[PDB]
Amino acid sequence: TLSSAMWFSWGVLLNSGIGEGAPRSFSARILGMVWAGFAMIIVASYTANLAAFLVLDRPEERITGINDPRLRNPSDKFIYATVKQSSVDIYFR
Amino acid sequence: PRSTLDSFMQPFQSTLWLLVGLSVHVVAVMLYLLDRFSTLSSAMWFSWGVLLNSGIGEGAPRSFSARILGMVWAGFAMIIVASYTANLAAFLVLDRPEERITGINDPRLRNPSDKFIYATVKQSSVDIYFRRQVELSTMYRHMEKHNYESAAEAIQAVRDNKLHAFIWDSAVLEFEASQK
Amino acid sequence: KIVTIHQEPFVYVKPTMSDGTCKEEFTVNGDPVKKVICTGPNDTSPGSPRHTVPQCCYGFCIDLLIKLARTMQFTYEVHLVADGKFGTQERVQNSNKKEWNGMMGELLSGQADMIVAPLTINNERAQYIEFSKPFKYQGLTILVKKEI
Amino acid sequence: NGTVSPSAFLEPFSACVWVMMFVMLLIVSAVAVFVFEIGKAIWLLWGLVFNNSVPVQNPKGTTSKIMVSVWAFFAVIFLASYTANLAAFMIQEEYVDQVSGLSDKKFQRPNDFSPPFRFGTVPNGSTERNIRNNYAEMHAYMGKFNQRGVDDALLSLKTGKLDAFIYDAAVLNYMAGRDEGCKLVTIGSGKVFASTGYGIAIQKDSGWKRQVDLAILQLFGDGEMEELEALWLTGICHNEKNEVMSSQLDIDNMAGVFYMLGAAMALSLITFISEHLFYKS
Amino acid sequence: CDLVTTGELFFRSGFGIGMRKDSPWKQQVSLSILKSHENGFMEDLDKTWVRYQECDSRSNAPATLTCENMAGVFMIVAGGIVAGIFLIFIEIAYKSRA
Ligand SMILES: *[C@@H]1O[C@H](CO)[C@@H](O[C@@H]2O[C@H](CO)[C@@H](O)[C@H](O)[C@H]2NC(C)=O)[C@H](O)[C@H]1NC(C)=O
Structure with a gap:
């Protein structure tokens, strides 16, 4: 129960069932x-971690459509345009 | 709110439980069959506790x-555990649907229905804003009916569900719902 | 006389294999693809030799044409626009009389009978060109690189 | 309710990862005899495949049990893999049940399925007047399901007196917007049979055609139509990009995974009597 | 897969055969095109071209998983098993001569 102890808690955090014995x-x-208990807390920790590993993707792609403030005020930042001599442009004229 | 608890019942349907228990004892009987063809009650013991994963720990299939x-x-037991997990996912995230009330552009308010009733104080400066405009003209036309004398009364009324909605200036109401 | 422009969803432009020959291929649905010859220059660049060869063409619109054919049976020849565009109004560099270019142009000038194309339906052109019922419903949009 | 999640979304969390679980599992089986100096390995690391089940005693090997710690980290990590699988259940709703198509099969043969299926439209339907050309048997069988008035029809769908309903996309869209709760929607994304539209027809053989033409042309000129739907067509509901959710954890499909279990046990009976037959020689 | 449709949809529009001024052909043509839309001919046209989906939908996806992570974890596992053979022989010698 000396080295077997650290054995016991190590496997405990592993929860793999080493199974030599117990604290007297x-x-x-x-x-x-x-x-x-705190080991279970670490497992759950891995669980919520996984929650981060799946849900809640990255932020917006902008491009919300013709009312996008982005397009509303042209910046050298983003460039949005169409075909030279476009019927589209004709609508825009 | 309508989302909470329901305990051991919530994360499954009764039929699923019938599958787990009944088919559990079934596959147990299958194990005993595998024993006596070529640890009897202890077997169904073993698989029962297996689905329990509680470590009964008598012995194993030979x-x-x-x-x-x-x-x-x-393996399928682990699958049932995970089943409880995703079940819990339903038990937490993904709340109910929209509360409407998206604001003055709500289609709901755009076309008055006997369904929802939204209005303001009789002789309200608010109404004064609503008086001269082209757009609400339908609305102002619809809003004379149920208007009330004192906004407090409105608070009471929707508070009794006699109103769907009320029109006023924000801060006051932030205070109000902030209270209740 | 029918005219169009190379356009991704509809017009497909590839040369003949040897001469006047279009490789016969089936579909994912196993359909015996119908195609026909088409005339237009392979340049697309401004200020370059305009000499024209019939290459092969196939596509959606083309199909719709054939539908007209089995519907209204008549001879037809198909070609593209002198430029690489659809068209817009404008005037001459001097004296400014109202003018046009593009598929609209070859039409008003009379260089062709038919424009087969994902034609924007505006107010103005109908003040000149006749319309049908729409054969598709499209609209404006925007496009950008997907998120990494 | 739904949706169509037969426990294999966990396989989307894994797929060939499982193959690696078999192969590398056998690698660990080799590690048993390796660190030793048979099935014990199976029940052991396969013991790690989930929470311990097999009572079988751990191998006394110090370095061996250290390898048991290796497959232990592997194991808890795998439990995490299934955590994120459940996460895949969190999002990922197909929100698809009976949606097929106008000409599709599931609606092609009414008597085909076991429970009586019914759908249709109002009489004299322009849309229906096309439907007759669509398929004859359709109009024939749906004659019994014809209904007078749109509203009570809707109420019969919500109530369940009818499965689904046939009409033009118009009231589907608008009515779809307005309901007490958000429930109904058209099948699919709005794929529409008989591409068509509203307009204004007039006295035939006039000249006023071109005039009004250019008119509503100009109506899209200002794009005032935006304002127009804004005052009318704007919906509260839908935005179907959101997948909504479910509750009760009611899964017949996962029970299907249980059927994969039981059937696997049948295979175990097959190979069971087979190895029993191997006992002769 | 590299690109995505915009958020909204605006400027309601459509496509019809270009023909000049006034020639009788208008009526015949459009009438015929209804004579298609009356049936699945157009949808068939999707099947001929539009229908084929080379990549998945707009998505942004809920989730999916392929073997990358598990390759790393299982990697440390197996390399740790060989490490267990190495150190296994080492400690085997240590306790053997202990
Ligand atoms: C659909 O049109 C038919 C006729 O094309 C209508 O049939 C009439 O129905 C009324 C009452 O249902 C009868 O009194 C008439 O004798 C019917 N006439 C014919 C020629 O059938 C039918 O009513 C229309 N649909 C609805 C809902 O009214």
Whole structure:
């Protein structure tokens, strides 16, 4: 229960069932109890992490359409245009 | 709000439960069959706790192919756990649909219906803004009816659901709903 | 006489294989693709030799033409516009009398009977050219690179 | 409710990753005898494949059990993989049930399915007057489902007295906008049979045609039509890019995955009597 | 796949056969084009051209996964297994001569 201990908590965080034995001291067994609790907390941590790993994609692509403020005030930043001599342009004239 | 709790019931349908339990004992009987063809009650014990994943821990299936049967079984158990997970995803994110009230351009307000009732104070400076314009002319035409004397009364009225909506100046109302 | 312009969704312009020959290919739906010869220059650049060869063409609009054919049976020849554009109004560099260029132009001048094209339907052209019911419904849009 | 998520979205979280799970799993099986100096490996790392099940004792090998720690990190990581799979259930709603097409099959043969299916339109439908040319049997069978008035028809759909309804895209769009709650929508993106439109026809053989033509032409000239739909066609509902959601965790499809389980157990019976037959010689 | 349609849709518009001034051909043509839209001829035209979808839809996607991550994790796993053979022999010697 010396090296086998660190064995026990290491595998505990692994939750893989090494399974040698347990802490004898009741209060200390409560220490490891809270420990394994925090391990579950680390698992859940990986869960919420995964939530970040999936939902909530990046921000807007702009291009909201003809009312886009972007297009409303031309900037050297973005360039939006059409065909030379476009019926489209004829609508724009 | 209409979203909360429902506990062990929420994250499934009764039929699914019938599948889990009934088919669970079924595949258990299949395991016992794999035992007696070529650990009897202890088997159904083993798969039952397997779906429980609680570590009953008596023993294991001897037949290698059958042990693969239970292998896929426990796999489907993990699948049931994940099932509870996605279930929980439904139990949290993706709330109900829109509350309408998108503002003065709400199509709802654009075409008055006996359905929703939105109005303001009788003789309201608000109304004074609504008086001379081309656009609301329909609206102002529709809004004489249910207008009230004191906005507080309106608060009471929608608060009794006798109103769909009320028109006033914002800050006051921010204070109001901020209160209730 | 029918005229058009190379346009991605509809007109497809490739040379003949040897001469006047268009490689016969099927569809993903297995259809025996109908195609026909088409005349227009391969230049697209301004200020370059305008000499014209019939290359091959196929496409949506082309199909619609054939539909006219089995509907109204008559001979037809198909060509593109002198330029690489549709058209706009304008005047001469001097004296400014109202003029036109483009498919509209060859039409008003009379260089062709028919314009087959994703034709914008405006107010102005109808003050000159006749219209049909629409054979498609399109509208304006904008395009940009997808998000990395 | 839905939607069409038969537990294989987890495979979208993995796909060939599973193949790697088999192969590399066998690699670990080789690691058992490797760090040792059979099926024990299977029940062991496959034990890691999820929460422990097989009671089988861990290998006493120190370095061996260290490898067990390797497949342990692999395991918890995999549980995470399924976490993000459930995430794939969070978003990713097809929101597609009966949507097929005007000429499509599911509506082609009414008697085909088991539960009675019914759809149709109002009499004298211009749209319907096309539908007769669309297919004859359609008008024939839908004759019994004809209905008088649009509103009570809608109320019969919400109530369920009818499955779906046939009409022009007009009231589909506008009516689609206005409802107490947001529920109904047309099938698909708005793919419309009989491409057509509203206009104003007049006394035939006039000249006023070209005039009014140029007129509403100019109406798109100012683009005032924008203002026009703005005062009318503007919807509250839809914006179907959002996939909405469901609840109750009601899955017949995932139960289908359970059927994949049971059927796999049948395969286990096959190979079971097979290996039983291998016991002769 | 590189590009995406704009957000809204505006300037309601359409396509019809270009023909000059006044010639009887107008009526015949358009009448015929209704004579198509009456049936799936046009939709058939999609099937001939528009229908074929070379890439997925506009999306932005909910999600999807391919073997990249799992390649890294499983990578540290297997390289750790070989590491377990190396250190396995090492500690095997240590305890053997201990
Ligand atoms: C659709 O049109 C038909 C006729 O084309 C209408 O049929 C009439 O219906 C009324 C009452 O339903 C009868 O009194 C007449 O005798 C019918 N006439 C014929 C010629 O059938 C029918 O009513 C129309 N649809 C609706 C909803 O009114």
